[PDB]
């Protein structure tokens, strides 16, 4: 086990998929996605099973598997 594909679901139901190592910090995925949407990374919250993905979280830590989904929500007002 090395790489898995994660599906990132955009706010408009578009998707971008990322191949990541099980030990890669998910900051890299968050930054890439935000860059590709042209929005500041801190305007977004990235959720796995409804829980907030921190910059330092890894797929291994969060228990992610092949084709698991990450949802992108706008940050909450004041968050």
């Amino acid at each position: 086990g090395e790489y898995i594909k994660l599906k990132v679901i955009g706010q408009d139901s578009s998707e971008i998929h990322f191949k990541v190592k099980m030990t890669t910090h998910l900051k890299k995925l968050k930054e890439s996605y935000a860059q590709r949407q042209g929005v500041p990374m801190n305007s977004l919250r990235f959720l796995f099973e409804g829980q907030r993905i921190a910059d330092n979280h890894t797929p291994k830590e969060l228990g992610m598997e092949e084709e698991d989904v990450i949802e992108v929500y706008q940050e909450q007002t004041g968050g």
Binding site: S14, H17, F18, T24
Partner: peptide, 11 residues
């Protein structure tokens, strides 16, 4: 309509 998008992230 959108094409498939797969990005490999460096470690």
């Amino acid at each position: 309509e959108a094409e498939e998008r797969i990005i490999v992230l460096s470690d």
